[PDB]
Structure 1
Amino acid sequence: SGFRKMAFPSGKVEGCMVQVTCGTTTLNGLWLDDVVYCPRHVICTSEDMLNPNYEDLLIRKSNHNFLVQAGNVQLRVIGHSMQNCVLKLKVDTANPKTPKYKFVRIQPGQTFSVLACYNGSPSGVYQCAMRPNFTIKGSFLNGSCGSVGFNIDYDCVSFCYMHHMELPTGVHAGTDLEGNFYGPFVDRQTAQAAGTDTTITVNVLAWLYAAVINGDRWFLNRFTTTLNDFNLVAMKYNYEPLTQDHVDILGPLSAQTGIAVLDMCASLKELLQNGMNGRTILGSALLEDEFTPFDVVRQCSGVT
């Protein structure tokens, strides 16, 4: 028992991290097979970031201008191309530690682990979620760009995020591994305000099921509700609308605990209306929304 914000083991991804330098800019790259992927803004000076024309800036760079170092050894760059907001640097050596992998584009509410890196070296691993406004609340400093987000299914790493920037508000933005930003963000030093960061309802419900499974049951009430009644309350509290697809996804947790999804919705409705009254659930004084229903099942069953 116990329930922790758990990240995937990071070894398979540590084996892919490299340092990429272009001129005076250094950041991280992801080396898979004979390609290193990195944010295209590696070609920019800080002055370029104000109004960059990436195609024009890229014309001034040749393969030898991209310095890629894996551990303490240099990789030879034999090609380069830009795909949306990422650069793909073809190297002459396949990464011998390339795991089985896929590139996936996640939806808001989905969680993933981040391996925060600097200079191609791992600093730490944490778990987060793609927020409903397409930002992530990470822990990243200058030089962390190119650090990646991923999920693992047994031996296959699904890369879903590459870090590109911090918005003026201190939240983070990035792309999938095809170089497409999540949300409306652009890799430019311009006004980019984020939309409403709503609470991921289906994940809160999953976490209340995790709380019941782990014996924290005080919040269970004698009520039920309907999807429409619950959603009226969810809207008022800036929670995402709960759909029948979300109810279906919670079916395994409902079956495990014997608590109908709509009864748990009624317990969540009361928590929103009454507050916590100084109590905690799974050691939190707020309702946690960065565990998906699959995360709860995975952690509560010991998937490896």
Structure 2
Amino acid sequence: SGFRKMAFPSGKVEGCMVQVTCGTTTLNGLWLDDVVYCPRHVICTSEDMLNPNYEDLLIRKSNHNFLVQAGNVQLRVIGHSMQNCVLKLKVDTANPKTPKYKFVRIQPGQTFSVLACYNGSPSGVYQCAMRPNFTIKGSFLNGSCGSVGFNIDYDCVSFCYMHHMELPTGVHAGTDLEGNFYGPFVDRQTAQAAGTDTTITVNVLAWLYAAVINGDRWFLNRFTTTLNDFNLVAMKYNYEPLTQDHVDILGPLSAQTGIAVLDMCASLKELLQNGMNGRTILGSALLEDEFTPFDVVRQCSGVT
């Protein structure tokens, strides 16, 4: 019992963190096999960040200009290349601590753990969601660039995010491990619109099932709804429209609790229309959307 915003154990990722320095800029790198992945803005100075010509900036750099330190030992750089917004620094030694890994591009609404790092050293780990507007509400300061987001399946780390930038609104933007930004963002010091965010409806429903499993049941009502009726309410409250694909992923939780998905939607409809009335659900006074149905099943069953 109990339900927490749990992150994956970060050990496999800690072993990949390195410090990358180029000129006067230092940020975090990810050492997997014989390649170091890091945000390409490592080659920029503050004056360059206004409107950087990354191709031109990288042309003035040689392998010896990229200083890569793993803990206290220095890595020899034998190749460099830019893929989208990431730099891939080929090194002469494969990381002995490389876990089994994949590079994945997550969908918005999916969750992942972030190992926040500074100067190649890990400071903390937290769970978060890729927002529907492709931003993340993280905790990052200057120097945290290159920190990565990931998921773990048994022994395989699926890297999904590399941190690049803080928007003027204090929300965070980044790329997949191929250097492609999530969302419309560009790696420049310019104000950029994140766009309208929504609440991740399937995740709130999953968290409501987690609450019922763990004893918080006060919000269960004598009502039911339909997908169309619920979606009218979701539209009014800036919630993502629920589809049959969402209903299908909630199947395991509906089977476990015996509460039909549309019955749980009617509880969520009443919570949206009436509020919490000063009450709480799983220690929260708002509807939590950072747990996927998969996360709820994993945490509620103790998957390692």
TM-score range for the pair, normalised by the shorter chain length = over 0.9
Per-residue displacement from partner, 1:239-261 (whole Å, max 9, x unpaired)? 00000000000000000000000
Per-residue displacement from partner, 1:33-68 (whole Å, max 9, x unpaired)? 000000000000011000100000000000000000
Helix, strand or coil at the partner of 1:282: coil
Percent identity of equivalent pairs? 100
CA offset at residue 194 of structure 1? Answer: 1.1
CA offset at residue 279 of structure 1? Answer: 0.2
Does the CA-based 8 Å contact 1:13-1:115 persist in structure 2? yes
TM-score, L = length of structure 2: 1.00
Find the aligned partners of 1:174 and 1:263 in 2 and give their Cα distance: 37
CA offset at residue 190 of structure 1? Answer: 1.0
Find the aligned partners of 2:253 and 2:104 in 1 and give their Cα distance: 26
Counterpart for residue 47 of structure 2: 47
- Please provide the CA RMSD for this pair: 0.3
CA offset at residue 196 of structure 1? Answer: 1.1
Per-residue displacement from partner, 1:172-224 (whole Å, max 9, x unpaired)? 00000000000000000112021112100000000000000000000000000
Counterpart for residue 291 of structure 2: 291
Does the CA-based 8 Å contact 1:20-1:27 persist in structure 2? yes
Find the aligned partners of 1:48 and 1:198 in 2 and give their Cα distance: 34
Helix, strand or coil at the partner of 1:161: strand
Helix, strand or coil at the partner of 1:182: coil
Does the CA-based 8 Å contact 1:22-1:66 persist in structure 2? yes
Per-residue displacement from partner, 1:245-291 (whole Å, max 9, x unpaired)? 00000000000000000000000000000000000000000000000
Counterpart for residue 124 of structure 1: 124
Find the aligned partners of 2:169 and 2:10 in 1 and give their Cα distance: 28
Does the CA-based 8 Å contact 1:103-1:159 persist in structure 2? yes
Helix, strand or coil at the partner of 2:268: helix
Find the aligned partners of 1:19 and 1:297 in 2 and give their Cα distance: 36
Find the aligned partners of 1:297 and 1:27 in 2 and give their Cα distance: 36
Per-residue displacement from partner, 1:83-141 (whole Å, max 9, x unpaired)? 00000000000000000000000000000000000000000000000000000000000
Per-residue displacement from partner, 1:65-89 (whole Å, max 9, x unpaired)? 0000000000000000000000000
Find the aligned partners of 2:280 and 2:99 in 1 and give their Cα distance: 40
Does the CA-based 8 Å contact 1:169-1:193 persist in structure 2? no
Helix, strand or coil at the partner of 1:159: strand
Find the aligned partners of 1:159 and 1:263 in 2 and give their Cα distance: 36
Find the aligned partners of 1:61 and 1:35 in 2 and give their Cα distance: 17
**Which ranges of structure 2 fall in alignment gaps of 5 or more residues?**
none
Does the CA-based 8 Å contact 1:28-1:147 persist in structure 2? yes
Counterpart for residue 70 of structure 1: 70
Helix, strand or coil at the partner of 1:52: coil
Helix, strand or coil at the partner of 2:139: coil
Per-residue displacement from partner, 1:142-164 (whole Å, max 9, x unpaired)? 00000000000000000000000
Moved over 4 A (4+): none
